[PDB]
Enzyme design. Structure first.
Site, mmCIF file in Angstrom:
data_model
loop_
_atom_site.group_PDB
_atom_site.id
_atom_site.type_symbol
_atom_site.label_atom_id
_atom_site.label_comp_id
_atom_site.label_asym_id
_atom_site.label_seq_id
_atom_site.Cartn_x
_atom_site.Cartn_y
_atom_site.Cartn_z
ATOM 1 N N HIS A 12 0.647 -1.148 0.045
ATOM 2 C CA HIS A 12 -0.029 -0.470 0.216
ATOM 3 C C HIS A 12 1.255 0.979 -0.457
ATOM 4 O O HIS A 12 0.433 2.120 0.269
ATOM 5 C CB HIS A 12 -1.346 -0.360 0.860
ATOM 6 N N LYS A 39 -5.227 -9.727 -7.273
ATOM 7 C CA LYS A 39 -5.822 -9.175 -6.264
ATOM 8 C C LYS A 39 -6.474 -8.115 -6.574
ATOM 9 O O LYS A 39 -6.330 -7.795 -7.983
ATOM 10 C CB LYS A 39 -4.614 -8.169 -4.900
ATOM 11 N N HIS A 113 -3.238 -2.278 8.071
ATOM 12 C CA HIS A 113 -4.481 -2.034 7.501
ATOM 13 C C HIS A 113 -5.086 -1.215 6.164
ATOM 14 O O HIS A 113 -4.862 -0.221 7.015
ATOM 15 C CB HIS A 113 -5.859 -2.724 8.364
#
EC number: 3.1.27.-
Length: 121
Positions: A12, A39, A113
């Protein structure tokens, strides 16, 4: 020690991307090992690591819903969305560049996350 933070950076974070087109997404998704299986959707945040960590505290974050945090500042982001029927490579991606706040979960002051729901579209 904080390997979920490492995983977060890998999945990310991309500091200085350049051209954030389809071919960007195809290359980076492969390089970060997110293509076996492909993904479905993945967003990379760009810019400063400091600013992202700061979402875990009052500096650049507010509490959000249950256990999440949401940034005060807006980030340049790029979302890679899988296209085609197959979950297996080769993985073709459509890139959507953006500029908005992000939603994370933190542990021990570090993002672990990214909530991808806000980038679905």
């Amino acid at each position: 020690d904080n390997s979920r933070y490492t995983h977060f950076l890998t999945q990310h974070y991309d500091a200085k991307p350049q051209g954030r087109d389809d071919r960007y997404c195809e290359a980076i998704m492969r390089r970060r090992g997110l293509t076996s299986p492909c993904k479905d959707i993945n967003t990379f945040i760009h810019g400063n690591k400091r600013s992202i960590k700061a979402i875990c505290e009052n500096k650049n974050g507010n509490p959000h819903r249950e256990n999440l945090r949401i940034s005060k500042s807006s980030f340049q982001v790029t979302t890679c969305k899988l296209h085609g029927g197959s979950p297996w490579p080769p993985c073709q991606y459509r890139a959507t560049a953006g500029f908005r706040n992000v939603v994370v979960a933190c542990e021990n002051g570090l993002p672990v996350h990214l909530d991808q729901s806000i980038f679905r579209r």
